[PDB]
Amino acid sequence: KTHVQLSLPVLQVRDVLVRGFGDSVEEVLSEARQHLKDGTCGLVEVEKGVLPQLEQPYVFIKRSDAAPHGHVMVELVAELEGIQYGRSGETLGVLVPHVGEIPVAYRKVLLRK
Secondary structure (H helix, E strand, O other), X not given: OOEEEEEEEEOOHHHOOOOOOOOOXXXXXXXXXHHHHHOOEEEEOOOOOOHHHOOOOEEEEEEOOOXXXXXXXXXXXXXXXXXXXXXXXXXXXXXXXOOOOOOOXXXXXXXXX
């Protein structure tokens, strides 16, 4: 399938134990997709002071369209030193590994895969 329905655990930035997916744009997009597929991917909502507490390169989910079955359609954009790899809509948040942190909420997304 070109798209996959996912429910992403929303984590508080200060709870996150593994604060990024790796060391290159290509690695973080690779690892983010692997974690999304394996159900081991969390989402941190981007507010003032969040991104400086996470590791670059960042992986964003961004709105790709204006929402089947409650799932917002999203795609992955990476960012490293202020340059984005990909072009998409509004940030729904920043993806991080999930290693058992307790979420505050779930974000239903339809991931272009």
